[PDB]
Every structure is written in structure tokens, then in C-alpha cells.
């Protein structure tokens, strides 16, 4: 789910960049170091609002190292999945152990043990799919799934979905 959050970043600048263009350079450095990153605490930062008018304040010189430390506060759009949430998805891969879907930047893996039994995996089909009499879910097929668990990594998030309840599966 997408949100607006007020975040802050600590930026350290080498003395070789102490020029008139210091502020703009700090702005592009912030944009390059925040746009697209993935933090387990917050999720995924997709964009920074008002990216060219961010206040940086006054940097403090670190005693003994010369480099200046800047405290940058900004507002950004953040997306983070939650346990027990039902969202739309697009299937990216089909495999006997289960199928992998994509919910924005997040890639969700659904095991066969969380798939209804009538959706038997068909490897002979082109492309291979988990199909039933009235349902056929393959690569590129819209699916509505509920996120059950989320795994936190260093700079990545792994989520597990399920389609075993009602109003789920193919859409």
C-alpha cells in the first residue's frame, strides 16, 4: 500500500565539493541514493516529492575529518505490503513448486500448498500453467492474492501470497 511519509537522511560531503553548487549537488546525491532503494522498515521508496526544492540546512563540520554532515528532511512516496492484505498482481513465472507474481517492485512467491487443489499445474500447456476447469493462470495473467508473510532482507523484501480463499485466484 502506498503512503506519504516525512523521512530524513544524513548526508556526508567531502571537502572537495565545497563550492557554490553544493546545494544542487546534495540534491542530486539524495535523489540517486534514495530513489528506488528498499528498506525493510519502510518498504520501497519510489519517488521524492518536490525534489528540486528540498531544504538541506547548514552542514556541521565533523571534528578531525573535515567532511561536513548534512541533515536532509524530505517527503516521499513509499509502498509497503502488510500481512493479511489482498492486492492485485501479474504472474511472472510458472514452476512446479509454485508461481511467482509481481506487485509493483515486489516479487511474490506462492507455493502449491497455498493454491487451490483444482488448479493442477499443467506442464504440457504452452506456456505451462496452473489450470482448472474454468480457471487458467499462466505468465502474464492477472491474479488477486492475499499476502500472508513478509521476509525482511538487507535491502530486499520477500513476500508470500495465497489464493486459497474466496474472491482470490484468477481475475
Amino acid at each position: 500500500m502506498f503512503f506519504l511519509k516525512d523521512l530524513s537522511l544524513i548526508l556526508t560531503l567531502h571537502p572537495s565539493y565545497f563550492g557554490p553548487q553544493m546545494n544542487q549537488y546534495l540534491r542530486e546525491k539524495l535523489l540517486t541514493d534514495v530513489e528506488g532503494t528498499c528498506t525493510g522498515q519502510f518498504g520501497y521508496i519510489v519517488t521524492v516529492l518536490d525534489g528540486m526544492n528540498i531544504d538541506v540546512g547548514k552542514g556541521r563540520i565533523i571534528p578531525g575529518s573535515g567532511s561536513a554532515e548534512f541533515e536532509v528532511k524530505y517527503r516521499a512516496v513509499v509502498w509497503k505490503p502488510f500481512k493479511g492484505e489482498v492486492v492485485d498482481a501479474i504472474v511472472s513465472n510458472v514452476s512446479p513448486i509454485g508461481f511467482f507474481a509481481d506487485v509493483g517492485p515486489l516479487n511474490v512467491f506462492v507455493s502449491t500448498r497455498l493454491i487451490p487443489d483444482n488448479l493442477v499445474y499443467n506442464p504440457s500447456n504452452s506456456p505451462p500453467a496452473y489450470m482448472s476447469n474454468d480457471e487458467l493462470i499462466t505468465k502474464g495473467s492477472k491474479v488477486r492474492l492475499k499476502v500472508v508473510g513478509t521476509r525482511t532482507d538487507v535491502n530486499e523484501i520477500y513476500a508470500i501470497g495465497s489464493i486459497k480463499e474466496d474472491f482470490l485466484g484468477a481475475i
Binding site: 504440457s124 500447456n125 504452452s126 506456456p127 474454468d134 474466496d166 474472491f167 481475475i171
Partner: protein
């Protein structure tokens, strides 16, 4: 070849369930008149792609009947609901008057003109507007242009779901198609002169028939495609020839401006049907070539492994073959001080 026999029997055992499912579905439809296209394409059905084509044709031309049989509730939206509304609406007679479905099928199957597409006495816009004005109560369309677009898209869907057009396009692509590769920005930057993907960075018009002799090239192209670097495109040099031939079969012979409008509508719907049909045929051909190359490489690896492990023990002189010799091994590993 015996391993191929085992694989082929497994494949047919798999597709037998699908063909039985299609037979059961058709029996549940219980058509008053047996559809000649159904019989003709079911008798010659060999691949699961053709079975899927049969299923699509049956579901499209009997969407109401198939939906009822499903009913004979999760609010899944039927993708054919709009077409069912068109069937129920007063504009469906105009869609009939464009061209007779049975006559179209006979002409296409014969590949030559058996009947002439009769142009209605009034232009498509004339008939659409007249029926809209005389049936404002039932015509669900708002403007005559909207009804015109709906009729064109319905005709395009009818042409697209015709099994014969799909079969002809698939045969043409499988016989005379070529392979072209496009590069994404990731492909534009990551395909380096030392990378193994550099062999096909700018390949063009590669014959399909020659691919089976070199499976690794196609496998590597697919692997590069899966990495988000390249895009594989299959195109036919004579696609315009097939389009023109099918248009000539479908087009009417009238010369009046009303006939000109009817021919324009038919041609536009036919182009839309081609636009919808091309990706599916491309994917089917791609999967077929993938399976062929994979099987070739599987057999090649099997032969290589067999050659690797086919060696009898060393035969000492003055002894028969198969005798185990006494052996002494001397080694030091590296040779450093």
C-alpha cells in the same frame, strides 16, 4: 528413437485428457446442427494449440450457451459480455448482413470464391443510424459512431476466432518465418564483445528451419531475452500476401460507394483481427521452436555423456578384454618446493 517413443507416448497421454475434455464440452453444448468447422478441425486436431483454438472458437460463437452451461456466485466479468449484448441488441442483424458466417467459412475453407459477398442495399452508417432511430428503446449505443465501432470490433473478433485463419497463419510462420532480435537499453549497454550474447546482438532474418541444427543459439537468445536485454521477433516476408489473399476471399465485389464502405469496414475489422491474432501465433511458434531445440540439445547431451562413460577398463597385454589390471598411482599434486 525409443526414448523419443517414450516421450511421445507421454505427450499423447497428456493431450488425450484435453481432447476428451473438449469432446465433453462439445457434447454438453449439444448443438442442434453439428458445426462443420468443429468436426473438420477436430478430426485433424493434433497439437494442443489446435485444441485451444477449438475451445476459443466454441466459447466465442456460443458464449451465451457456454455461460448457461456453466450456470447449469463469484462475479467474474465475462470478457464476452459486450459481444453477448451485441448479439442481443438490434445491431446484430447488421453484423449478419455484412457477410454470412457459413458462406465465409465455406469460402475460406475452399480457398476460392464459392459465393459472392452481397453488399447490403444501404451503407453501414445508413443502416446503423436508421436502426438506432427506429429502435431507440433497445439500441444500447449512444451515437451511431459508437455502434459502428462496436460492429467493427465484433467483426474483428469473429474473424480472429476463426480456426482456419489461425491455422493458416501458424503454418505459414512455421514454414517460412524468420527470426529477428531487438535490443533494449539494457541490451544496448550490456551486450559486450566478450559476452556470449554478442553472437546475436544484431542478427536479422535468421531462418527458422536452420535453428534446429544449432539449438544453443536459440537457447542463448531466449536466455538473453529472459534477462531483459533483447527481444525476439518472428516475422514473415510475405505477410502482406496472406493478408491480401484473405481480404480478396473476404472482400465483396461491389463497386458502389455503399459497397466501398462495406469493403472498408470489412478490411478494417480484418486488420484488427490480424493485430489481435499475430502475438498468439508468434508465441506458439516460439514455444514450438523452443521445444525442438531443447529436445535436440537433450539428445546431444545424452550422446556426449554416453561417449564420456563408455570405456572398458585398461587391458594389459597377453590378457583378454575385461580383465581387471593391477595398478600403481604416483602423484605429488603441485610440485612446489
Amino acid at each position: 528413437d525409443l526414448w523419443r517413443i517414450v516421450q511421445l507416448d507421454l505427450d499423447y497421454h497428456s493431450i488425450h485428457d484435453k481432447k476428451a475434455a473438449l469432446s465433453s464440452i462439445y457434447k454438453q453444448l449439444d448443438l442442434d446442427v453439428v458445426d462443420p468447422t468443429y468436426e473438420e478441425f477436430f478430426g485433424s486436431a493434433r497439437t494442443l494449440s489446435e485444441l485451444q483454438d477449438i475451445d476459443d472458437y466454441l466459447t466465442f460463437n456460443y458464449s451465451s450457451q457456454v455461460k448457461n452451461l456453466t450456470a447449469v456466485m463469484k462475479r467474474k466479468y465475462s470478457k464476452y459480455a459486450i459481444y453477448d449484448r451485441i448479439r442481443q441488441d438490434a445491431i446484430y442483424p447488421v453484423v449478419q448482413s455484412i457477410a454470412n458466417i457459413s458462406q465465409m467459412r465455406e469460402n475460406l475453407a475452399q480457398s476460392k470464391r464459392l459465393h459472392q459477398v452481397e453488399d447490403p442495399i444501404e451503407s453501414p452508417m445508413d443502416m446503423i443510424a436508421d436502426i438506432m432511430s427506429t429502435e431507440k428503446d433497445k439500441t444500447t449505443f449512444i451515437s451511431s459512431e459508437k455502434a459502428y465501432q462496436a460492429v467493427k470490433q465484433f467483426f474483428s473478433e469473429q474473424l480472429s476466432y476463426e480456426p482456419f485463419i489461425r491455422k493458416t497463419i501458424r503454418t505459414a510462420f512455421q514454414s517460412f518465418g524468420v527470426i529477428n532480435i531487438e535490443l533494449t537499453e539494457r541490451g544496448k549497454l550490456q551486450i559486450e564483445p566478450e559476452s556470449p550474447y554478442f553472437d546475436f546482438k544484431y542478427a536479422k532474418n535468421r531462418p527458422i528451419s536452420a535453428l534446429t541444427a544449432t539449438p544453443d543459439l536459440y537457447l542463448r537468445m531466449i536466455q538473453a531475452e529472459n534477462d531483459g536485454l533483447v527481444n525476439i521477433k518472428v516475422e514473415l516476408p510475405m505477410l502482406s500476401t496472406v493478408v491480401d489473399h484473405f481480404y480478396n476471399i473476404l472482400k465483396s465485389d461491389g463497386t458502389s460507394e455503399i459497397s466501398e464502405k462495406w469493403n472498408a469496414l470489412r478490411n478494417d475489422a480484418w486488420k484488427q483481427s490480424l493485430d489481435k491474432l499475430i502475438p498468439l501465433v508468434q508465441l506458439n511458434v516460439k514455444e514450438s521452436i523452443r521445444r525442438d531445440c531443447e529436445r535436440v540439445l537433450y539428445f546431444q547431451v545424452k550422446n556426449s555423456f554416453t561417449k564420456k562413460i563408455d570405456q572398458a577398463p585398461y587391458q594389459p597385454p597377453t590378457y583378454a578384454k575385461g580383465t581387471i589390471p593391477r595398478v600403481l598411482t604416483l602423484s605429488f599434486g603441485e610440485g612446489n618446493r
